[PDB]
């Protein structure tokens with residue numbers, strides 16, 4: 001749905017995400033530019049060394065089966081992946097909050 005930005009670049013996704021109006025955990029999903037066949041979760045975060053920043057998480061997919069950031073926490077679809085990380089961070093920088101406007 002709405003959060004799937006497709007073939008958007010890393011840099012453009014960082015420019016969209018970095019808007020100060022975006023709360024922590026504003027996100028998108030896109031393709032990986034560098035890993036082909038893979039996806040990325042791009043997430044806004046904040047620390048006080050750097051302020052506003054973005055984290056990117058590689059999404060992989062085992063061949064005949066699950067989508068994953070870490071290999072024991074798998075999901076059958078990208079939908080399930082994102083719906084999970086919106087309930088809990090589970091190791092992520094932040095829980096997923098806002099879909100990115102863009």
Ligand SMILES: CN(CCCC1CCCCC1)C(=O)[C@H](CCC(=O)O)NC(=O)N(CC(=O)O)Cc1ccc(OP(=O)(O)O)cc1
Nearest residue numbers: 010031032033034035040055056057058069070090091092
């Ligand atoms: C899968 N994990 C490892 C950690 C996963 C956690 C999840 C919670 C539970 C415990 C394990 C990653 O993905 C990490 C996540 C953030 C981080 O740990 O810092 N990110 C990463 O390794 N990056 C590469 C780098 O630093 O070289 C950043 C990056 C840059 C461009 C990009 O985009 P693209 O794919 O289009 O090139 C995609 C990624």
